Design an enzyme around this catalytic site. Structure first.
Site, PDB file in Angstrom:
ATOM      1  N   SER B  42       0.810  -1.224   0.035  1.00 33.50           N
ATOM      2  CA  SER B  42       0.155   0.021  -0.109  1.00 33.50           C
ATOM      3  C   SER B  42       0.842   1.162   0.112  1.00 33.50           C
ATOM      4  O   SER B  42       0.925   2.000   0.836  1.00 33.50           O
ATOM      5  CB  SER B  42      -0.944  -0.101   1.155  1.00 33.50           C
ATOM      6  OG  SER B  42      -0.243  -0.211   2.229  1.00 33.50           O
ATOM      7  N   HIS B 158      -4.386  -6.932  -1.007  1.00 38.27           N
ATOM      8  CA  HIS B 158      -3.718  -8.440  -1.037  1.00 38.27           C
ATOM      9  C   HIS B 158      -3.383  -9.065   0.560  1.00 38.27           C
ATOM     10  O   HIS B 158      -2.463  -9.295   0.795  1.00 38.27           O
ATOM     11  CB  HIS B 158      -2.422  -8.306  -1.812  1.00 38.27           C
ATOM     12  CG  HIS B 158      -2.824  -7.489  -3.024  1.00 38.27           C
ATOM     13  ND1 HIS B 158      -2.780  -8.352  -4.258  1.00 38.27           N
ATOM     14  CD2 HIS B 158      -2.851  -6.668  -3.488  1.00 38.27           C
ATOM     15  CE1 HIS B 158      -2.871  -7.906  -5.013  1.00 38.27           C
ATOM     16  NE2 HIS B 158      -2.945  -6.440  -5.050  1.00 38.27           N
ATOM     17  N   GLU B 167      -4.785  -2.804   9.104  1.00 41.39           N
ATOM     18  CA  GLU B 167      -4.070  -3.395  10.143  1.00 41.39           C
ATOM     19  C   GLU B 167      -4.825  -3.004  11.489  1.00 41.39           C
ATOM     20  O   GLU B 167      -5.117  -1.750  11.976  1.00 41.39           O
ATOM     21  CB  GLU B 167      -2.717  -2.389  10.316  1.00 41.39           C
ATOM     22  CG  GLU B 167      -1.884  -2.595   8.825  1.00 41.39           C
ATOM     23  CD  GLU B 167      -0.442  -2.024   9.139  1.00 41.39           C
ATOM     24  OE1 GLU B 167      -0.046  -1.638  10.389  1.00 41.39           O
ATOM     25  OE2 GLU B 167       0.135  -2.176   7.905  1.00 41.39           O
ATOM     26  N   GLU B 210       1.908  -9.568   6.883  1.00 42.91           N
ATOM     27  CA  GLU B 210       2.507  -9.196   8.234  1.00 42.91           C
ATOM     28  C   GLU B 210       2.389  -9.955   9.294  1.00 42.91           C
ATOM     29  O   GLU B 210       3.016  -9.814  10.597  1.00 42.91           O
ATOM     30  CB  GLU B 210       2.211  -7.746   8.466  1.00 42.91           C
ATOM     31  CG  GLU B 210       2.630  -6.835   7.458  1.00 42.91           C
ATOM     32  CD  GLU B 210       2.533  -5.222   7.779  1.00 42.91           C
ATOM     33  OE1 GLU B 210       1.967  -5.065   9.016  1.00 42.91           O
ATOM     34  OE2 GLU B 210       2.717  -4.379   6.902  1.00 42.91           O
ATOM     35  N   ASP B 245      -4.014   0.786  11.456  1.00 42.30           N
ATOM     36  CA  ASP B 245      -3.766   1.575  10.173  1.00 42.30           C
ATOM     37  C   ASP B 245      -4.736   1.337   9.249  1.00 42.30           C
ATOM     38  O   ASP B 245      -4.918  -0.048   8.971  1.00 42.30           O
ATOM     39  CB  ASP B 245      -2.198   0.868   9.597  1.00 42.30           C
ATOM     40  CG  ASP B 245      -1.881   1.580   8.406  1.00 42.30           C
ATOM     41  OD1 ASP B 245      -2.582   2.694   7.769  1.00 42.30           O
ATOM     42  OD2 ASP B 245      -0.751   1.123   7.780  1.00 42.30           O
ATOM     43  N   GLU B 293      -3.530   5.218  12.193  1.00 44.20           N
ATOM     44  CA  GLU B 293      -2.782   5.509  11.182  1.00 44.20           C
ATOM     45  C   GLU B 293      -3.507   5.580   9.875  1.00 44.20           C
ATOM     46  O   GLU B 293      -4.319   4.879   9.429  1.00 44.20           O
ATOM     47  CB  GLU B 293      -1.440   4.933  10.961  1.00 44.20           C
ATOM     48  CG  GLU B 293      -0.486   4.855   9.879  1.00 44.20           C
ATOM     49  CD  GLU B 293       0.278   3.793   9.592  1.00 44.20           C
ATOM     50  OE1 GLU B 293       0.490   2.977  10.368  1.00 44.20           O
ATOM     51  OE2 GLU B 293       0.664   3.559   8.483  1.00 44.20           O
ATOM     52  N   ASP B 320       1.230   8.335   7.383  1.00 48.27           N
ATOM     53  CA  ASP B 320       2.122   7.243   6.885  1.00 48.27           C
ATOM     54  C   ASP B 320       2.098   7.682   5.203  1.00 48.27           C
ATOM     55  O   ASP B 320       3.140   8.284   4.938  1.00 48.27           O
ATOM     56  CB  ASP B 320       1.475   6.002   7.006  1.00 48.27           C
ATOM     57  CG  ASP B 320       2.135   4.792   6.172  1.00 48.27           C
ATOM     58  OD1 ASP B 320       3.451   5.025   5.689  1.00 48.27           O
ATOM     59  OD2 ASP B 320       1.624   3.756   5.869  1.00 48.27           O
ATOM     60  N   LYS B 345       9.433   5.453   7.605  1.00 43.10           N
ATOM     61  CA  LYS B 345       9.758   4.277   6.733  1.00 43.10           C
ATOM     62  C   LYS B 345      10.939   4.927   5.907  1.00 43.10           C
ATOM     63  O   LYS B 345      10.988   5.778   5.190  1.00 43.10           O
ATOM     64  CB  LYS B 345       8.445   3.775   5.702  1.00 43.10           C
ATOM     65  CG  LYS B 345       7.824   3.159   6.262  1.00 43.10           C
ATOM     66  CD  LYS B 345       6.282   3.158   5.685  1.00 43.10           C
ATOM     67  CE  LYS B 345       5.359   2.179   6.192  1.00 43.10           C
ATOM     68  NZ  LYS B 345       3.908   2.393   5.476  1.00 43.10           N
ATOM     69  N   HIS B 373       8.146  -1.053   9.624  1.00 45.33           N
ATOM     70  CA  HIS B 373       8.589  -2.130   8.592  1.00 45.33           C
ATOM     71  C   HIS B 373       7.681  -1.684   7.304  1.00 45.33           C
ATOM     72  O   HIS B 373       7.088  -0.653   7.381  1.00 45.33           O
ATOM     73  CB  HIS B 373       8.229  -3.545   9.061  1.00 45.33           C
ATOM     74  CG  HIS B 373       6.837  -3.560   9.314  1.00 45.33           C
ATOM     75  ND1 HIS B 373       6.214  -4.674   9.359  1.00 45.33           N
ATOM     76  CD2 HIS B 373       5.800  -2.772   9.428  1.00 45.33           C
ATOM     77  CE1 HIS B 373       4.886  -4.943   9.702  1.00 45.33           C
ATOM     78  NE2 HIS B 373       4.571  -3.511   9.737  1.00 45.33           N
ATOM     79  N   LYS B 396       6.518  -0.158  14.807  1.00 44.79           N
ATOM     80  CA  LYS B 396       5.767  -1.414  14.215  1.00 44.79           C
ATOM     81  C   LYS B 396       6.400  -2.309  13.116  1.00 44.79           C
ATOM     82  O   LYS B 396       6.912  -1.781  12.203  1.00 44.79           O
ATOM     83  CB  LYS B 396       4.272  -0.873  13.773  1.00 44.79           C
ATOM     84  CG  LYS B 396       4.088  -0.353  12.320  1.00 44.79           C
ATOM     85  CD  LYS B 396       2.680  -0.177  11.966  1.00 44.79           C
ATOM     86  CE  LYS B 396       2.956   0.093  10.286  1.00 44.79           C
ATOM     87  NZ  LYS B 396       1.433   0.685   9.919  1.00 44.79           N
TER      88      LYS B 396
HETATM   89 ZN   LIG Z   1       0.981   1.616   2.815  1.00 49.32          ZN
HETATM   90 ZN   LIG Z   2       0.477   2.363   6.850  1.00 50.64          ZN
END
Ligand SMILES: [Zn+2]
Ligand SMILES: [Zn+2]
Ligand SMILES: [Zn+2]
Ligand SMILES: [Zn+2]
Ligand SMILES: [Zn+2]
Ligand SMILES: [Zn+2]
Lengths: 431, 431
Positions: B42, B158, B167, B210, B245, B293, B320, B345, B373, B396
């Site tokens: 994403s 996915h 999340e 994840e 998330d 998030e 994010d 990130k 991550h 995370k």
């Molecule tokens: Zn993403």
């Molecule tokens: Zn995110």
């Protein structure tokens, strides 16, 4: 003295299922050499002892504090100041420290991490990569990159589906390099995901412990056409073979002497060993199945021997639970001609020396050796080096998915690159 | 000269989804320093360029041969003989080698691996662990072990289910150490598996990218009671908080200006941003949700700002995709008071220097920073060191499941052990 083991330290870390396991660091002047111990789910009854704490207040009893204490307080202090080059000597010391056949006192999970990290410290001392060092220990004449057998449809014990048999794998046997093998495996894996999503729906493409898809399949025959379809769709028709790990012991009832093909379902489906042989003969004929692991219960030497003879030269029969990487069990298997391939799991036996002895005994008796992960893995990559070192040409270390699998595959890429364009690839029998 | 960079080499390796990514090794006299680049699914439209080959004959176009060539043929030769200690200088050199704002020429995936490996080579040169070295670069006054936010029910793009939001995480905020945090997280994760199996059946407990469970849930509210149940059952009532998330951009249609909560289903379910805010206010009230998030699309600064103000002091709002670890986007977010937490990130921006600058800018403006991550990870553990180095108290890095997640968690264990009993743990705001 200056070149010897300076520090040995164990710690509890998590494996790829989020369960504790043991990691050991051996420190020398050359650095810190870290090795983690894998953990099986479908563990053979003859495996060396995996020592767990059994404290329900931690990790509902799966803590490895005791094995870690054994490393820190018993094994490590014994190793300090010792010559890490002396692999057999140190492994034997560890065997004697434990004093039990099954490593039940200190735990194979305490011992093995030490055995591993010692070998890495020793490689650094020799100034060679781990695979070279292990090849010298094993007397291996020719290194080779293995064909990876990728477990891409996951079933059996604690896979989220009805599928009773554990591993349906694809192996790019006609790849001419490890790089090419890995890409092909990944490509098929990706095609397979789309195929499973189309056939079983969105919910079918989440992954099992070893990174294969865990589709809602009950029948053991059903994954095979799907594998062939994915191979075809990815553009790799004719390049691949199939490997099976039935883990048949997990379905076996000792009292009934039959196999429950729906043991994760409300109703049981009792099938005999003779019905299984029919199924395996059919498999071997209908598909390019070049390997069947644990087709029968771990003490069914006669069942093993029958299928070994029946598929001789077509399909290797791999002892995993049968043999538990243990020269005693291997000798029984050789005597009965029970199988012709060793699934080599360092943590089934618990020292590198013993694992190497098992590989040498099997190869001297004309078996192939498939170095293997466990279903509970870590970021450790020892088996990548080990398989190259043994030159066996066969590894199973997961689908090309999940870091505890791809870590091994990546390490194989690195080793392949170090060895260069003349490095042998694959299993000659399958090429 | 003797202490400088001797060799720089890139190679294509696989990530945890079996897709190629870039790994870089910088060799110095102190050794070989290896760093791999993660890959998002994403991915925000403002992320630095991830350069893929687009060759349908390899990895259906996802090869990283070009980024690897860029490392081998352009970046690496520039770095040879350079002082790896000069992180800003070398990162800036790499920025200038590329010459584009988005790293579209060389690829952020070529650059970042170099940036990372340089910092590791530099840490070795200084003779300190990576986290210490990075803390010096960042000017961090106090190291800390972060509270991990564990993405234990996986949805969105996915994940194999109807669940549109990405999340649903649990964070052991009241743990008093990282060791304790990790065990608690794992324990809840294990309880959660049994809870999901009982409620949704066997087929519901396979895992997402994840390592969270991917149960057949469609409705975004449904995972939350399950999380609370697992927390309770594992024995950790009151110890945990929840982090979300939403990755709301993945559900967002720009033309309709609405969010499709069934975008992985045949029929769409169009919901407005104002309907989402109601949902988030309800979430924050009904559950101990301390972090949300990407609650809104990546360019909805006004939506972000509204929910930031509404949950101020109760629930941090994490940029994010909004911020993409990019001081330009961060400045826009600060100006609009759009959020008060940075999801950091490294591969959203592409150099360590820039990632550190982003963390410092956010913290100076009173935001928290959650080092993250990507959903496509490797066995690389850089972010474990980075989060400790930044002392942000929040990471995370996956469910406690799958090696590319547990590798980070384990590295955090190792760092915790090195820092000893006086090492700070957790996020003070949540403790
Ligand atoms: Zn993403
Ligand atoms: Zn995110
Ligand atoms: Zn010396
Ligand atoms: Zn097994
Ligand atoms: Zn097996
Ligand atoms: Zn020097």
């Amino acid at each position: 003295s200056h070149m010897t083991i300076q520090k040995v330290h164990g710690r509890e870390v998590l494996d790829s299922r989020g369960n504790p396991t043991v990691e050991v660091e051996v420190t020398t002047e050359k650095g810190v050499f870290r090795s983690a111990v894998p953990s099986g789910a479908s563990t053979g009854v003859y495996e060396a002892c995996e020592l767990r704490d059994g404290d329900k207040k931690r990790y509902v009893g799966k803590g490895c504090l005791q094995a870690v204490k054994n490393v820190n307080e018993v094994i490590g202090p014994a190793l300090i100041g010792r010559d890490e080059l002396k692999q057999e000597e140190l492994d034997t010391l560890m065997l004697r420290l434990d004093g039990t056949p099954n490593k039940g006192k200190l735990g194979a999970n305490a011992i093995l991490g030490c055995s591993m990290a010692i070998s890495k410290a020793a490689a650094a001392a020799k100034g060679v990569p781990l695979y070279r060092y292990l090849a010298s220990l094993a007397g291996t004449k020719e290194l080779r990159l293995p064909v990876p057998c990728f477990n891409v449809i996951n079933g059996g014990k604690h896979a989220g589906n009805a599928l009773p048999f554990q591993e349906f794998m694809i192996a790019p046997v006609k790849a001419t390099s490890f790089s090419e093998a890995l890409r092909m495996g990944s490509e098929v894996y990706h095609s397979l995901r789309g195929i499973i999503k189309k056939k079983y729906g969105q919910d079918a493409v989440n992954v099992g412990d070893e990174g294969g898809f865990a589709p809602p399949i009950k029948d053991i025959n059903e994954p095979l056409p799907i594998l062939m379809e994915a191979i075809e769709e990815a553009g790799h028709r004719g390049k691949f073979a199939i490997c099976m790990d039935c883990a048949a012991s997990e379905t076996y009832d000792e009292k009934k002497q039959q196999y429950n093909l729906t043991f994760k379902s409300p109703e049981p489906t009792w099938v005999t060993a003779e019905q299984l042989r029919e199924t395996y003969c059919k498999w071997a004929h209908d598909y390019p199945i070049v390997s069947i692991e644990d087709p029968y219960d771990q003490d069914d030497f006669a069942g093993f021997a029958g299928i070994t003879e029946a598929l001789k030269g077509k399909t290797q029969i791999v002892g995993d639970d049968l043999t538990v990487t243990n020269t005693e069990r291997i000798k029984m298997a050789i005597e009965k001609k029970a199988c012709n391939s060793l699934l080599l799991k360092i943590n089934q036996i618990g020292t590198i020396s013993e694992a190497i002895a098992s590989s040498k005994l099997c190869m001297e008796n004309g078996w192939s050796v498939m170095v293997s992960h466990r279903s509970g893995e870590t970021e450790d990559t020892y088996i990548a080096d080990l398989v190259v070192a043994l030159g066996s040409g066969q590894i199973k270390t997961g689908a090309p998915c999940r870091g505890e699998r791809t870590a091994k595959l990546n390490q194989l890429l690195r080793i392949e690159e170090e060895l260069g364009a003349h490095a042998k690839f694959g299993f000659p029998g399958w090429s």
